[PDB]
Every structure is written in structure tokens, then in C-alpha cells.
Automatic annotation (TrEMBL), chains B, F:
Identification of the protein by name: Tubulin beta chain
GO molecular function, one term: metal ion binding
Domain Tubulin/FtsZ 2-layer sandwich, chain residue ranges per copy: 246-383
Domain (Tubulin/FtsZ GTPase): residue spans on this chain: 47-244
Organism: Strongylocentrotus purpuratus (Purple sea urchin)
Classification via SMART domains: Tubulin, Tubulin_C
PROSITE patterns found in the cross-reference section: TUBULIN, TUBULIN_B_AUTOREG
From TrEMBL, chain C:
Location of the protein in the cell: Cytoplasm, Cytoskeleton
Gene Ontology CC entries for this record: cytoplasm; microtubule
SMART domains: Tubulin (SM00864), Tubulin_C (SM00865)
Protein name: Tubulin alpha chain
Pfam families: Tubulin (PF00091), Tubulin_C (PF03953)
Automatic annotation (TrEMBL), chain D:
Location of this fragment in the whole protein: 210 to 261 of 469
Species classification: Eukaryota, Metazoa, Echinodermata, Eleutherozoa, Echinozoa
Listed name of the protein: Protein phosphatase 1 regulatory subunit 32
Recorded superkingdom: Eukaryota
UniProtKB/TrEMBL annotation, chain E:
Name recorded for this polypeptide: Uncharacterized protein
Alphabetical list of PANTHER family matching this protein: PARKIN COREGULATED GENE PROTEIN, PARKIN COREGULATED GENE PROTEIN PARK2 COREGULATED
UniProt GO molecular function: Hsp70 protein binding; Hsp90 protein binding
Phylogenetic lineage: Eukaryota, Metazoa, Echinodermata, Eleutherozoa, Echinozoa
Pfam family, one: ParcG
GO cellular component terms, semicolon-separated: cytosol; neuron projection; vesicle
Organism, as annotated: Strongylocentrotus purpuratus
């Protein structure tokens, strides 16, 4: 954040949603109180690209402590859900610890 | 330094504007975060036409977004290049005027016109110089046509000399898609004749035909349709953003293509359009772009440009090219298809060459034709309107929000008068 | 002490100036920053730049010229170019709005806010000199800035500096090729308002240079740089007798006393014809007779207004290089013996010869080659009446239906001015007819 | 199935990660004709070869 | 070789292109169904009759012209101008020309209604109806008091065909024009409609008149 | 800059033309992708005869592929040098030809004819000379016969002065593999004789004989058959492509082999053609090439030229050789077999020599022979036609598809007049 008397940087909480039906990703914001900023969807459900070669973000390369770039925004993942961890361990990911 | 402020109204207008601010951000090297990850200084020298400097490095678009459904604002913010826009310039109502011209023009939508005029005034006063006002909307919806016509009327009576272009997704019957669509189109064209400085009529049916026949493309969706629309929106105003040889801005296009103060309903066209497989099996040359412009296949208006005569046709070429090749090709087009051009105008072609092509293409061009074949679209909309208005179907709404049948008769008769004027200047003799 | 002030009005004028000042710097040895190399030299003498330049004392050869365009784009790309340091920043004058191919916008509303500053810079450049030769104005008949602002500045210059000679290097519209739509309107209006304020107006046609570049230089894809370099060669050949030295000479004042018969007929043609590439430059003898015959060929005219339809009045025949004063006499004699080239009966003595020993200057990356001799012809022919007649017919076709008149009428320009321009053009029409018969 | 690639050049979408500078791109922006043609020339230094 | 334009067939060394079909902006447009003057008259009402004469006829009114309702009778008297199967054409045009000269202030309020019958007659382009309609227009503006100023909003909608047919005069040299008595010269009648508009209009009339017809100029 | 446009119609035509374009590509140093990986400058000196430039320095052949059944395009794209063709030239129908001349001529081939003429005009406008057209097809099917003849008629109507050569494949009574071959060949040679400048009759029986006895090859197959036909097709235009001492283009050959207008049915011939065991016993000289050209077993058509009179003989010699040796080998064969040459035409051999031999071939020679012995094929097809036309067998398909028995009778009559003209010029005397 530039030119503000209250902070010089901000952290906006983010919940990702990976839909396995079509390998799509939607980002959502949990609407924190008194934020004063328009919170809401911030990226709807689509197939988000991964490389410049046309590859898209799959679930085979999404883990606990990683950075994922979507549209110039570099989100960093913190923790999973219980069903998601069970499914990911069933498919064979290592699930390298919540942060 | 010339600035244009851009506006999108309705769901179709907002989607077209989102694709437009994706396409020209790709042209100008703008990150969806907002930063300049560009390569050339010419990419930044005239970025102020559509953008505005934000302290920190961001480039805020000079765009104003209008609807009465907040879901449209949520969708355009959650689209790609969605965080680009400033959230103040997201003025919306709550009722959802939603395919009702009366609701979008006289009732509760008209409680939003003062606020959108305030925000447009604020965005317009922060300019050293001003060219005009850009609008994207569809004529078959309540917010696109109702608040669209109201906004054009208000901004025209406030700023009388700054020019104004609207991009007018005009209805087609083969896509149908809305019952009160002829009513909305007839009530919008009445104001667009008198208020709008220049307008481009665009048909979704013609876009679908282009995607099916020239682009193959299997499934085109609305992304590709809005991408062709955004391409021909970006190609018109490339002389205001990139230098080169002989160039024409929006006012030059209006002056050289409007012979009489009402014949300003144009026909867009963008023509390095080829399929994915037949892309490298091509040699981009000025004669084959001239091929692809002067073809009934590649026109984004579902009316054939052969049941009528071209009044004025302008082409904005883009690429490092030969002016002899440009003039020779279009002069050859005039001489050989001399029957399809009006003979009381000796040269019916305006050329504007900008040497900086869109990224990825060596060569491109944008077609804008002022044909007398727009009377086909206007006659088909008028005949649908009089078919519905002979039995007064779907009129209890539009008289419940407080209009009169005299307004409908006046709008129908004005569109008929415009059709008669196009017919007169089509069939007018040499001397 | 001789000085020529250049004014470059419009995009065409500014690009032609970008060609011609490059040619001047290359032929005088001035580097793009402004200084002489000071380690090498090309040799012209201590004073063979004063017609177009000035010395600041430090060694900065700031040039002349009052580069002006209403739109910012071409002026700022010139400012951000190779010759950024050469030009004085106050010389390059620009505005915000564009005249947008409107004579009314160039002459009545948008031009008048910048006329005063352009005139002040012109006054400063005129006070900077000692003896002013003339005003070299580069523009197009075209539309907007080059049509309206050029005429307004011409009126102001006629009011202020009445006796100084004016040259009007102008891009005349082609017969069949055209770019703008209201180009006939702008052409007729700028002709009407340059008739009483011109001194001599040179015509250049883009389509004719296109065909000449195709036929001679053998290029099928020429851009505006390949045309503006030829126009640079024209202006250099015309005013090289002021700068360099040689045989029988000419300054800007003889170009109206030996080329303008009546104070209406001041539109000579331009014909440079050693137009040859490096592939065929050394395989043929470029003798004086050959180049003058090729100059009187109608295919080498840069107007495409074929002179066999009319008769020649005067021909200012400028020679540049290893030209013999008897060889030019033999060439003119053997062409006056020809019966295809026709001269009017009241001008037996129809030539004005001027010879310089300076060879022509090539541009690196240019299309022309190094030649021993060059010929530039300024021919005032009656054949241009057919070009006036064609633009008259175009004006009649547009003005009969009153197409594109609402812009001019609604922003300035009471309606009678269109008929004024049309009537003065018709007066010029049968003026040409009466001086031809 | 509501989002495809662009129909003009059919170039795939990008994640817009600026890990490489903006000059390093596969679709660069064009250059002006006056800049490409009107270029600074090279003077004859003197220590060249004798021409035939 | 015959070819349709703007294609590879259109560009050949021996091919010629087909001319576009005309839109017919100078042709007649006869009605597919008769007006409300053939439905309301032979059904009854209309207190008018022929009294026979030689020039034309005269309309004998069985009620006072000045007292009858112009809000009812007048706009649907103008509906009878668009036909020709005449016993009706005299009943239309002389009814117009009589009620107008023998009205008064009553013409001005019904003017906003008095547009759709006029324009519909104008958008038929019959060469004998159109002159009658123009002669009606020359008498509307001279008929009442402050009447040529209420038409100024509707200069938009009474002038789309006068633009088309103002150049409809004949180039017949020094031949005597014997059709000067029966005033049926459209290219002239349009001119005396326009100068009457300028004379009995207001002051912002001319900006709209030039907005409509491009080659008109101040009288 | 003389360019000739290739058309390949039918399964036989496409399979011959794929091998022809493979031979042309690896003779001009073109990879399957299209990039010039060649060595000499002569490979690009006259590349514009068969190839068109694209972006990236890639050469696309100036050919169109025509068929009704879509699987042959899949076969062509399956073949090597299949991706080099432009995808817009793949003009394919959807249903089947039906081995029916009427179906290929008066119906759905006649509905695809507008699109194939559109692409032919598109590929012919990209020329500066347009020397002529070549077409590859067979007289056995519906697309090869009927659609090919319709293409010939439309091309002759459009471009009347340009030359047309068709490498037509004629049926054989020994090979057959079709019961409507007499009908198809009889109906197609009627259009061939009246709208083609020159045509080459190739017989599958003769191809198999060449593959079995001059080549001693165990399994010949259509690949080697089309290899021989493609070598002939290259050799007739190598004088156009590569430089040589004596130049003879298609118009040269047409004027030197056609005495009377409906006498343009030639039989071709290629030399050298040797087996594996005959490579040792091979004196690589001009005389064995001349003898293998003039041998009756080496003819590419089933006709025995000893049963007739050689009107004209054209000899295209590719390679490094003399002029005295070539002229004396053309002289001596005439002097000894003067009985097989017409006595009312002296010195009836045309001789051309191209300096460039084909790749992997030290010397080569294309024989073309206009003789009166060609009438054996027309006699065979005419009597096979009338044998099954006397009882109107298989005629219900054609008549219900839309032809006429009058058309059948007139085609047979024109064939008989062609045979009678060949016979009268066979037995015509000098004095
Ligand atoms: N020879 C030559 N002619 C040019 C060049 N640039 C423009 N022109 C001519 O100028 C004509 C157009 O009028 P312009 O003088 O360019 O108009 P403008 O100066 O841009 O003024 P506005 O139209 O108001 O923007 C064209 O028809 C060209 O023939 C150039 O670089 N060289
Ligand atoms: N080209 C294009 N047309 C659209 C799009 N979305 C809707 N439309 C068209 O717009 C019409 C409906 O207009 P709408 O946007 O609902 O107007 P509104 O109700 O005032 O918001 C439909 O007939 C669609 O064909 C889009 O994304 N692109
Ligand atoms: N030499 C040769 N002949 C072929 C080839 N393919 C087919 N033929 C002959 O062509 C005839 C069939 O014609 P066809 O191609 O099916 O005609 P279509 O049905 O119109 O496509 C058969 O009798 C074959 O002998 C080939 O690759 N080479
Ligand atoms: Mg300009």
C-alpha cells in the first residue's frame, strides 16, 4: 500500500476453490469487517492458465506451502480442508504441512 | 494530449468493455495488477488517451461502468483484468432494469443518471484536452438502451462540441433472444440519430457467421465475439495512441465519413481474420487485407453490403507498409466495383496508416463503412416493431412506467424517415 | 548573409522537412547533434550553411524552420528522433487538437490560437538574420492543418513582410489516387486563399512519384520516406545556387520573374530526372543531352498532368554537377527543334538556365545513386488546367448535393465562401484558357 | 466451455508472471518508420582501406 | 463474365459486375388498404355534399364550418389526401382548403396531431397527390394565427420527401410552360412551401430547415 | 515467372498428385514442413512455378485437392509431404461419388463446383504470368471423370487462352476393377476432346507391365505406379523450371504435337527404368535412353505404337549430354522406322534438353508420342460402351440421376468421329 497513514502493506484473506468437475479455480474473499475496500469474488470460476505455453493450473501441482500465480497475483497457500487433504493423500500428494 | 473517457452500460456493454480493457491493456503492456510490464517507450508515450496515472505505478482506466444489476459489477470485477478498474467507477442500481426501456429511461434507472453524470464529470474535468465520449451498449436491453440513450442525451447537452461514439450492438432476428427487443431498438435509435456523433452498428448474428465461416472456430462463445468487437474498437483509435504515417483520429473519421448530419450509422470490420490451421499458410499483404475488408463475409453487421451503395468507407491500416500499395489497392476497388459506390462523390475512401501493428500480427486493418444497406436492418427492426405495435402487445409495461403511444409512433416514424433518407441518397442520380 | 526561412505546415510538411533537413545536414557535414565533426571535414567553405543555419558562437549549428502541426504526434516523434539535439525546442511548435481534415478548423477556430506564437517565432528567426531571401513553405493542399493554417499564416506573412519572396512547395492531390474525402474542398479553399498571397507555388504529386519510383528506381513498395527524399532533392536543387557556387546562378527572386507570366499563373511543375538507382548508374553515360531529354519526357514529370495536352510558358532549367555551359545550350537547342514539346507563341525565349558545379548529395540508405550531373526543371505549363478542371468537377459533384458542407458551415465559414472559391477557380480556369489561346 | 483463446492470433493466455523483463517477449511491439529509416550515419574515419 | 461484386469473380481481366438493385426512393407506393376516408364516409356522417360547378365543384356544408370540431374532423379529413379513386379527392382537398380558411385559432391546438396524415401522404410519392399535399402545406401556415411556429418541432417530419423531389423540374429550354395554371410542379411547389415556412415561421426555423434540406438558403 | 496451377481430382488423382508433389519437393529441396533445406540456387531460381511464398520463408504448393468422399484427404494428410499443402485448398464434399459420372457432373459435385472455382480463382490471382493449368484424374470414377470434366469446362470458360494439360488415367479391359468404366470413360473423353489443350493417356495395364518387365518388381503397387506417372509429370515441365540449352514449355509442346485440334491425346514414356539385376549391364549413355524411350513395351499407355503411325514425337532430355548425339539419336530412329512415322510430316520429332537432371538420376528422358495407335483405347471403350448400351444395362442410374440417352448417343458418336479422324490421318497419303 502506498501513501497511507494506517499501513504500508496489507494482507487480504483468500479462500481458493478447485472444482474437480472441470478442473476450474475460483478465488473468494471472506468479507472481513470494516475493511473499507470492495471485497467479493475477485476471480470467478474458470480454467486459470499456468504457463505461457497454454498449460493450465491442475490439482497435481497444488500443495500446502507454495506460490501460485493467477493473473499477475501471486497467492501463497497456507492450509487445506479435511476432505481435501484426504482426497489429495488418496490421489498421492505428500501434503507438506500447513503453515 | 487528447483523452477519451470510456463508458459501458448493460450486461453486453460491460462484457464488451471488459474484453476491450483486456485487449488494449495487452496492446499497451498493462499487467492485470495494473503495472507497466512493457518493452517500448512508444507503448507509454500515448498511454494517457485511455489510462490515468495512479501514484505507485498503477494505470487506472478512464472507464465508467453502469448497470442496475450488481451481479454484473461482481462479474466484471471477477473477470480477468477485473482489478484494473477503479471501484468508484462502478456505479450501479439495485432494481435490475433488465430489458425494459421505460424502466431504464424514466423510472428508477433515472435516479442513477445524476450520480453517473457526476462521476463522468469528475473523470472528464481531469483532462488538459478532450476528444469525446466512448460508449458500449446493446440496443436490445433496458439498461443498454434506456440509460444509454439518457446518458448520451445528458452528455451531449452538457458537452456540445466534444465528439461521441457509441458501438451499438443492434438487434438481429435470426438470434432473436428477447421479445421486447424490437421495442428497445426502436426507442433507442430515435435518440441515437439525433444525439450520437458517430455510431457503429454491430450484429451478433454477423459475428457468429464470421466465426463459423471465416474463423471455423467450432465453438465461438461470447469471448471471441467480444474479442472481434474489441479489436475493431481498438483499431479505430490507434492513430490517437500510436504514431506513424498518414493518420486519422476520431474527429477526422467523423468529418470524412459523415456527409449529412444524420447519416452516421456505420459498419465495422476487422480483417486479418483466419483460422488456427490456416495461419502460417498465409502471406500478409495489402491486397489480401483489401480482399478481406471488401467482402460481404467479413462484415460485423447482418446486412449484405450489395443491396445498396457505399457512401464513405474508411480503412485504418496498421503495420510498416507501402502507401502506394494502399492507395493502389483501394483505388482499384473503387474502379472495379464502381457500381457499389455513390458516383456523386468522386473518392469514397479514407485511408489512415499507423505503422505500429497489434502485438503478434505483422499486419492488420480496420474497416468502417457507411453503406446505404443499413436500411435493411432498420427496415427489419421497423417491421418487427409494427408487427408488435399493430396489436399493442407488451405495451402495458411501457405505459405503466409512464410513456405514451405517441412516443412509440414518433420513434417508428423517425426511423422510417431515416430509412427514406438512406434510400434517397442511395438512389440519387449522378447530377 | 543570405538566409531562407523554412516553415513546415502539416504532417506532410513536417515529414518532408525531416527528409530535407537530413539531406542538408548530410550535404553540409553537420552532425545530428548540431556540431561539425571537428576531426574530419567535407569542405564547403566557412559560409556555405548560412542560408539555412546560424552560428551560436560555441559551434552549435541550430537550423531554421518553424515546424508546426496542430496534432502533437508527428512533432513529438521528431523531438524523440535522431535530430532531437539539432532543432531549437521553441522551433517545433505544436498544439493539442487536430484540424481533422477541415479547412474551417485550420483557418477559423483551431489555428488562430497558435498563429500568434508561430508568427512570434517567425519574427524572431527573421530578426536573427541580416538579409532574408525568402520563405520556403512546405505543405500539402490536403486538408486541415496544411490547407487552412498554411493559408492563414500566408495571409499574416503577406500583411507583415510584403516584399519578401515566398515558395509554396505543396503536395497537390493526385487525379485518381486520393486519401481524404473532403480533399477537393480543402484544395479549392486553399487555392482561393493562396492566390492573392502566393509568390510561387510548386506542385508535387504522390502518384506520379509512385510511378517514377516504380519505373526508374525499380521499387514496387515505396513509402512516404522514398517520396520525401525526392522532394528533398527538389528543394536542394532549387536553393543550392544560394549555398554553393558555380556558373550562371539564380536566387529565389528570379524564380518569380522568369517563371510567373501573370499574377495568377504561379504553379510550375517539378521534374528531377537523373532518377536512377545504383544498379544502373554507372552502366550509362549521364550526359547533359540525355538527362535534359529524360527531363522533358512526360513520364518523368512528378505531377502526372501530361504536358502534351497544353503548351509550355517558361522552364527554369537548373543543372547541378559537371555541366558544361555549351552542352546545356546544345540540349536546349535540340529540344526546341522538337515539335512534340510545344511553347506558347508569345514566349520564344522560354528558358531560364542556372548551373552549379556542386554534385548531388546522396543519402545513406536512400534509393538514388551518386551521379555526376542533375537536372531540376520548373516548368509552368498550360497543361495544369486539366488538373484544375478535374478538381473543379470533383468540387461540383460534391457541392451540388451539399455533401460535407455542414461541418464547414457550422464551425465558421459563411456559406458564400465555397462559391467564392469555386468562382475564383473558374476564373483561373478560363484565365489559363485565354493565356493558352 | 465459456472461455476460449483469442480468435485473432490464437495466442494462449498468460499468467502474467513478471519473472523475466518485458523486453524478453515473443510478441514485441513494432517500431516507427521514421525511426527505422532516418538513422544516424557513420562518418569516414580515415583509417579505412584504399578503394579501387 | 457476369459477376457479383467484391470477390475473386469481381476482380478479373474480363469480368463485369452486376449493378445493385435500386431501393425505389423516386417511385410510387400505392396503398394495400384504403384510408379511414373510405370507411367513415360511405358509412355515413361527414355533413358535406357536392354543389356542382365547372372549375372543380364546391362543398356544401350542412353545418357551420366555424363551429364544428377541428379536433375531430380535421386530422381525419387529412387522411383522405392519400388516395385516388375519386369522388373522394375533391371532398378531401376542398374540405381542407375550406375548413382552413374558415377556421381561426382552432387549427393551432390540433397541429401536434396534424402530422401522421401529412407524412403518410408524403411517403407515397404520387405525382398528383403530392402537389395537392404541398398546396395544403402552403395554406396551413397562412391559415391561422401563430401556426407556422408550432410546426418548427415537426420540420423534422414534414420534410423528408421535399428533400428528395425538390429537383423535379424540367430542362425544357425556351418552350412555353402551359402547365403553369394547373400548379403541379413539385420542384417549384417545394420552394414556395419552404419560403412560406421561412416567412411565417419564428426565428430558429432556418437552422432546422438547413438541417433537413441541405441546399436551402435564406429568403 | 510462368506459373501453372495444379488440380488433383479423385482418389487416383490425389494419390498421383501426392507422389508428384513429393517428387517436386525433394527435387526443389523442400522438407515436409515447407522450409527450404536445399543447397543450390537453381532450386529457388524458379520456385514460383509450383510454389507460393508465405510468412517465415515457407513454400506452399499451388495445388487444389478435389474429391467428394472425404477419406482421401485423410489419406493425403497421412502420407508424407501431407502437411505442406494449404488447408484451404482441401476442397472436399461429404457424400460419395458413387462411381457415377452423372452424380459427379450434374449433382453434388456440381454443388461443390462453386467452392472449387472460388479457390482456383484465389490461387490463380496470385500469379503474374499464369502459364496454364494441369489436372490429374482418372476416367473410371465420378470425381475423376465427371467432376474433373466439369472443372475442365469451367476453367475453359473462365480462362480461355491459357493452356490446360490433363494427365488422365484411362481404363483397361485387363485391369478393370469397375463395371461402369466404359460409361464413365465414354462420357469423360467427350468433354476431354473439346476443352483440353493437351492430355496424356496413362493406363494401369501399361503401368503394371512397366513395373513387371522393365523393372522386374515383385509387388508393384500404386505407390510405384504413381511414382512413374509423377516422374513423367515432372519431366514435362522441367524445361519450365530449370534452365537448359533447349527450352520447350507446355505451349511449345502443344504447338509441336497437335496438327489438328481434336488430336491432342498423347501417350507418355519415361527412361531410364532398370531392375536390380540390370544395373551392372547398363551403359549409361544417350542411346539406351533413346531406345528405351522408343521401345513399344516402355509406353505408359496400353497401345502398341507399331500398330499405327507416329504423327509427332517429343523428347525432353534432362541431364548433361550433347546436341549432336541427341539429334543423331532422334535422326536414326526416324530413318530406320520410317514406316511407323507419317510420310506427310517430315522431321516430326521435337527435341528439348534441360541441363539439370533430377536428383539421384544422372540422365533422364521424357517421351511423349502423338500417334494414331492411341485409337485402340477409344475403340475398346466405345465397343464396351455399346455392348452394355444395346440393352440399356446400368443406364437407369444415369437416367434417374438426370442425364439423357441422347447425351449418351452423342458422346458415343463423338468418340467414333475421333476414332475415324485418327484412322483417316493414319491411312492418309502424301501425294
Ligand atoms: N509526399 C508526401 N505526402 C504526404 C506525406 N504525409 C502526408 N502527405 C499528403 O498529405 C495528404 C493529407 O493531408 P495532410 O497534409 O497530411 O493533413 P494534415 O497535415 O495531417 O492535417 P490534418 O488532416 O488536419 O490532420 C495526403 O493525401 C498525402 O498525399 C508525406 O510524408 N510525404
Ligand atoms: N456480443 C455480445 N452480446 C451479448 C453479450 N451478452 C449479451 N449479449 C446480447 O445482448 C442482448 C441482451 O442485452 P442485455 O445485455 O441483457 O441488455 P440489458 O438487459 O439492458 O442489460 C442479448 O440478445 C445478447 O445477444 C456478450 O457478452 N457479447
Ligand atoms: N496408377 C494408379 N491408379 C489408381 C490409383 N488409385 C486408383 N487408381 C485407378 O483408378 C480407378 C478408380 O478411380 P477412383 O479414384 O476411385 O475415381 P473416383 O471414385 O471418382 O475417386 C481404379 O480402377 C484404379 O485402377 C493410384 O494410386 N495409381
Ligand atoms: Mg495531421
Amino acid at each position: 500500500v502506498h501513501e497511507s497513514p494506517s499501513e504500508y502493506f496489507r494482507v487480504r484473506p483468500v479462500i481458493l476453490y478447485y472444482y474437480l468437475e472441470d478442473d476450474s479455480i475460483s478465488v473468494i474473499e471472506p468479507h472481513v469487517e470494516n475493511s473499507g475496500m470492495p471485497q467479493g469474488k475477485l476471480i470467478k470460476r474458470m480454467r486459470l492458465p499456468k504457463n505461457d505455453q497454454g498449460d493450465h493450473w491442475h490439482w497435481k501441482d497444488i500443495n500446502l506451502n507454495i506460490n501460485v500465480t493467477f493473473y499477475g497475483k501471486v497467492f501463497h497457500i497456507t492450509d487445506c480442508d479435511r476432505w481435501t487433504s484426504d482426497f489429495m493423500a488418496s490421489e498421492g500428494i505428500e501434503l507438506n504441512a500447513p503453515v | 494530449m487528447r483523452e477519451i473517457v470510456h463508458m459501458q452500460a448493460g450486461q453486453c456493454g460491460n462484457q464488451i468493455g471488459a474484453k476491450f480493457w483486456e485487449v488494449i491493456s495487452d496492446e499497451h503492456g498493462i499487467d492485470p495488477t495494473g503495472t507497466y510490464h512493457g518493452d517500448s517507450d512508444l507503448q507509454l508515450e500515448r498511454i494517457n488517451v485511455y489510462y490515468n496515472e495512479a501514484t505507485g505505478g498503477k494505470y487506472v482506466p478512464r472507464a465508467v461502468l453502469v448497470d442496475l444489476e450488481p451481479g454484473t459489477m461482481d462479474s466484471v470485477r471477477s473477470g480477468p483484468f477485473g482489478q484494473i478498474f477503479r471501484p468508484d467507477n462502478f456505479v450501479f442500481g439495485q432494481s435490475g432494469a433488465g430489458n425494459n426501456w421505460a424502466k431504464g429511461h424514466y423510472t428508477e434507472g433515472a435516479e442513477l443518471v445524476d450520480s453517473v453524470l457526476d462521476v463522468v464529470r469528475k473523470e472528464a474535468e481531469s483532462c488538459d484536452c478532450l476528444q469525446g465520449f466512448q460508449l458500449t451498449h446493446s440496443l436490445g436491453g433496458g439498461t443498454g438502451s434506456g440509460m444509454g440513450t439518457l446518458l448520451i442525451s445528458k452528455i451531449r447537452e452538457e458537452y456540445p462540441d466534444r465528439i461521441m461514439n457509441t458501438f451499438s450492438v443492434v438487434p438481429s432476428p435470426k438470434v432473436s433472444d428477447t421479445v421486447v427487443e424490437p421495442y428497445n431498438a426502436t426507442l433507442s435509435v430515435h435518440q441515437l440519430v439525433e444525439n450520437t456523433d458517430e455510431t457503429y452498428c454491430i450484429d451478433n448474428e454477423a459475428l457468429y457467421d464470421i466465426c463459423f465461416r471465416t474463423l471455423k472456430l467450432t465453438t465461438p462463445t461470447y469471448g471471441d465475439l467480444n474479442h472481434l468487437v474489441s479489436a475493431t474498437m481498438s483499431g479505430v483509435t490507434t492513430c490517437l495512441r500510436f504514431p506513424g504515417q498518414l493518420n486519422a483520429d476520431l474527429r477526422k473519421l467523423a468529418v470524412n465519413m459523415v456527409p449529412f448530419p444524420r447519416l452516421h450509422f456505420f459498419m465495422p470490420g476487422f480483417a486479418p481474420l483466419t483460422s488456427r490451421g490456416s495461419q502460417q499458410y498465409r502471406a500478409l499483404t495489402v491486397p489480401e487485407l483489401t480482399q478481406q475488408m471488401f467482402d460481404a463475409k467479413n462484415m460485423m453487421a447482418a446486412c449484405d453490403p450489395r443491396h445498396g451503395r457505399y457512401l464513405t468507407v474508411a480503412a485504418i491500416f496498421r503495420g510498416r507498409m507501402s502507401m502506394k500499395e494502399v492507395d493502389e489497392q483501394m483505388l482499384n476497388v473503387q474502379n472495379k466495383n464502381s457500381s457499389y459506390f455513390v458516383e456523386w462523390i468522386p473518392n469514397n475512401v479514407k485511408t489512415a496508416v499507423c505503422d505500429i501493428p497489434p502485438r503478434g500480427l505483422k499486419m492488420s486493418a480496420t474497416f468502417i463503412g457507411n453503406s446505404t444497406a443499413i436500411q435493411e436492418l432498420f427496415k427489419r427492426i421497423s417491421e418487427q416493431f409494427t408487427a408488435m405495435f399493430r396489436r399493442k402487445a407488451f405495451l402495458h409495461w411501457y405505459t405503466g412506467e409512464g410513456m405514451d403511444e405517441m412516443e412509440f409512433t414518433e420513434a417508428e416514424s423517425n426511423m422510417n424517415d431515416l430509412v427514406s433518407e438512406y434510400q434517397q441518397y442511395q438512389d440519387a442520380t449522378a447530377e | 548573409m543570405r538566409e531562407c526561412i523554412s516553415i513546415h505546415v502539416g504532417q506532410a510538411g513536417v515529414q518532408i522537412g525531416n527528409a530535407c533537413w537530413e539531406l542538408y545536414c548530410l550535404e553540409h557535414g553537420i552532425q545530428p547533434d548540431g556540431q561539425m565533426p571537428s576531426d574530419k571535414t567535407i569542405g564547403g567553405g566557412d559560409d556555405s550553411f548560412n542560408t539555412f543555419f546560424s552560428e551560436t558562437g560555441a559551434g552549435k549549428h541550430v537550423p531554421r524552420a518553424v515546424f508546426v502541426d496542430l496534432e502533437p504526434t508527428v512533432v513529438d516523434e521528431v523531438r524523440t528522433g535522431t535530430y532531437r539535439q539539432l532543432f531549437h525546442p521553441e522551433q517545433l511548435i505544436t498544439g493539442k487538437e487536430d484540424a481533422a481534415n477541415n479547412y474551417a478548423r485550420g483557418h477559423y477556430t483551431i489555428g488562430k490560437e497558435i498563429v500568434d506564437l508561430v508568427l512570434d517565432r517567425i519574427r524572431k528567426l527573421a530578426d536573427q538574420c541580416t538579409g532574408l531571401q525568402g520563405f520556403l513553405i512546405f505543405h500539402s493542399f490536403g486538408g486541415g492543418t496544411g490547407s487552412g493554417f498554411a493559408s492563414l499564416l500566408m495571409e499574416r506573412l503577406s500583411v507583415d513582410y510584403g516584399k519578401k519572396s515566398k515558395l509554396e512547395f505543396a503536395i497537390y492531390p493526385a487525379p485518381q489516387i486520393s486519401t481524404a474525402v473532403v480533399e477537393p474542398y480543402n484544395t479549392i479553399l486553399t487555392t482561393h486563399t493562396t492566390l492573392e498571397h502566393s509568390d510561387c507555388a510548386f506542385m508535387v504529386d504522390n502518384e506520379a512519384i509512385y510511378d517514377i519510383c516504380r519505373r526508374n528506381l525499380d521499387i514496387e513498395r515505396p513509402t512516404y520516406t522514398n517520396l520525401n527524399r525526392l522532394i528533398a532533392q527538389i528543394v536542394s536543387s532549387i536553393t543550392a545556387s544560394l549555398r554553393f557556387d558555380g556558373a550562371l546562378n539564380v536566387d529565389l527572386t528570379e524564380f518569380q520573374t522568369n517563371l510567373v507570366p501573370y499574377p495568377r499563373i504561379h504553379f510550375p511543375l517539378a521534374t528531377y530526372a537523373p532518377v536512377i538507382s545504383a544498379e544502373k548508374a554507372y552502366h550509362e553515360q549521364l550526359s547533359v543531352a540525355e538527362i535534359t531529354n529524360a527531363c522533358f519526357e512526360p513520364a518523368n514529370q512528378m505531377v502526372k498532368c501530361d504536358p502534351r495536352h497544353g503548351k509550355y510558358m517558361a522552364c527554369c532549367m537548373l543543372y547541378r554537377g559537371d555541366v558544361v555551359p555549351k552542352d546545356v545550350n546544345a540540349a536546349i537547342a535540340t529540344i526546341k527543334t522538337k515539335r512534340t514539346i510545344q511553347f506558347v507563341d508569345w514566349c520564344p525565349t522560354g528558358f531560364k538556365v542556372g548551373i552549379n558545379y556542386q554534385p548531388p548529395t546522396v543519402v545513406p540508405g536512400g534509393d538514388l545513386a551518386k551521379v555526376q550531373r542533375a537536372v531540376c526543371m520548373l516548368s509552368n505549363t498550360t497543361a495544369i488546367a486539366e488538373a484544375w478542371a478535374r478538381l473543379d468537377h470533383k468540387f461540383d459533384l460534391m457541392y451540388a448535393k451539399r455533401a460535407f458542407v455542414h461541418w464547414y458551415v457550422g464551425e465558421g465559414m459563411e456559406e458564400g465562401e465555397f462559391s467564392e472559391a469555386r468562382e475564383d477557380l473558374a476564373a483561373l480556369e478560363k484565365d489559363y484558357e485565354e493565356v493558352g489561346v | 466451455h465459456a472461455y476460449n483463446v483469442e480468435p485473432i492470433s490464437f495466442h494462449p493466455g498468460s499468467p502474467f508472471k513478471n519473472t523475466t523483463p518485458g523486453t524478453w517477449t515473443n510478441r514485441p511491439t513494432g517500431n516507427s518508420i521514421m525511426k527505422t529509416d532516418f538513422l544516424p550515419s557513420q562518418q569516414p574515419s580515415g583509417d579505412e582501406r584504399l578503394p579501387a | 463474365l457476369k459477376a457479383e461484386g467484391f470477390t475473386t469473380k469481381s476482380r478479373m481481366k474480363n469480368a463485369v459486375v452486376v449493378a445493385p438493385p435500386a431501393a425505389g426512393a423516386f417511385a410510387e407506393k400505392p396503398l394495400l388498404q384504403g384510408t379511414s376516408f373510405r370507411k367513415f364516409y360511405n358509412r355515413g356522417d361527414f355533413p358535406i355534399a357536392l354543389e356542382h360547378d365547372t372549375k372543380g365543384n364546391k362543398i356544401a356544408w350542412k353545418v357551420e364550418i366555424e363551429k364544428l370540431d377541428y379536433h375531430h374532423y380535421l386530422p381525419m379529413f387529412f387522411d383522405g389526401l392519400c388516395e385516388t379513386t375519386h369522388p373522394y379527392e375533391f371532398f378531401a382537398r376542398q374540405g381542407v382548403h375550406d375548413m382552413l380558411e374558415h377556421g381561426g385559432s382552432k387549427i393551432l391546438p390540433v397541429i401536434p396531431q396534424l402530422i401522421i396524415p401529412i407524412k403518410s401522404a408524403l411517403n407515397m410519392k404520387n405525382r398528383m397527390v403530392l402537389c395537392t399535399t404541398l398546396k395544403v402545406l402552403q395554406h396551413l401556415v397562412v391559415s391561422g394565427e401563430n401556426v407556422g411556429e408550432a410546426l418548427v418541432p415537426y420540420y423534422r417530419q414534414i420534410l423528408p420527401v421535399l428533400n428528395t423531389f425538390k429537383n423535379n423540374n424540367l430542362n425544357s429550354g425556351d418552350s412555353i410552360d402551359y402547365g403553369q395554371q394547373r400548379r403541379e410542379n413539385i420542384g417549384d411547389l417545394i420552394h414556395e412551401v419552404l419560403v412560406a415556412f421561412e416567412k411565417k415561421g419564428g426565428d430558429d426555423a432556418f437552422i432546422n430547415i438547413k438541417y433537413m434540406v441541405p441546399t436551402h438558403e435564406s429568403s
